[model samples]
Target: MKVTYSGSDSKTYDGNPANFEPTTVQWSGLKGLNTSTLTSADFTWNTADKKAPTDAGKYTLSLNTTGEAALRKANPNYDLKTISGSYTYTINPLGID
Candidate 1:
């Protein structure tokens, strides 16, 4: 029951704001057929800024496992281990005239 949440993206400032989201999630030793019901939203950042940054800076994000608990509740047979990880996204500065 090893779960690896992958996909952290970097961003750049260009006047447009953006939000950070995981690219994909990998699960191992899943015993339930409803595993597909889980989505990225379940593993979203705990304090992730929903709004995109307008300035160049380093943003740190932590993994949230609330969704994992819910899944365990539904299927106790599946040993869905909770994986913890962090991602840092740096937005490069953009010069505009």
Candidate 2:
């Protein structure tokens, strides 16, 4: 499954990290997400890499491993599909960068 997010990430994420007022993410075009096996509502920032860039212009943010697992499906149809690769993103550059 491909996991991505959409929201107004701070150009400078200097605000409270938990401040996601208007920022919302949606899971689209995935078997698990469509089948209700995967959920995006249970997302959080990465534990090890939660820190924003020390010097920033436009930086992409990533959720914690817990979130990735949720997107990857706790119970996946591995026989029919295999999950691999990653993508990155906001006002936020995502190389897929």
Candidate 3:
């Protein structure tokens, strides 16, 4: 199974938590499965933290084990054929490099 995440926009620091927002998930090879109910809670940042980041930096975005379960629950026949991949989100500093 392959997962694709898109639209991790960059933002200037504004004292607010930066989110991996406006992101969308795509599932291949598991068509017709009900991923319609999946939410950000099903995913994670740096593979542990579930909350949005407040500091300015890069973070790894991917589906956690909890998300995997949800996937399998929807697609019971999904074997561990080809488990892979993640995305990266960036937060830029204000007016500086």
Candidate 4:
């Protein structure tokens, strides 16, 4: 999955663009039988500034499956559909950078 921060304008503005206000960050594209086993590599982060000034920066994270249906079965709450591919995640924030 990918994670990114959105500006107040409801768009991704990296590098602390003007009129762009960074806020709460979000994440998505979580796929796995057992979400707990998911690691940081399974996700990506916005690296616009790579620091703390890149408000509203956008990041792309991905997840890869390996025929781990049992993992999903263990976590029935997740309700994962497949287990042999990559999933993208998108995150948006609504707060100060």
Residue-level lDDT tens digits of model 3 in 21-97: 42355555545656765677777777346678877787777777877776667766655444355567778888854
* Tens digits of lDDT, candidate 2, 1-97: 4434454444433433433321344444355543244333344433356553433234434444655565456546533243332223333332341
TM-score of each: 0.52, 0.35, 0.66, 0.25
Model 4, C-alpha of 28: deviation from truth (Å)? 11
Runs in model 1 lying further than 4 Å from the true structure: 24-40, 43-52, 70-77
* Candidate 3: segments with Cα more than 4 A from true spot: 1-7, 29-33, 47-50, 76-82
* lDDT for position 78 in model 3: 58
Q: Write the per-residue lDDT of candidate 4 for residues 1-97, one digit (tens) a residue.
A: 4322221223444445332121222323554324444443333333464222334434432332432443454576765554333222233455575
Model-by-model lDDT, in order?
0.55, 0.40, 0.64, 0.36
Best by lDDT: 3
Task: Tell me the lDDT of candidate 1.
Answer: 0.55
lDDT of 1 by residue, 1-97 (tens): 5544444566667767546654444343443424455544555443346544667777655444666665666666666556554566667887677
- Rank order (by lDDT, best first): 3, 1, 2, 4
User: Could you tell me which 10 consecutive residues in candidate 2 have the lowest summed lDDT?
Assistant: 85-94
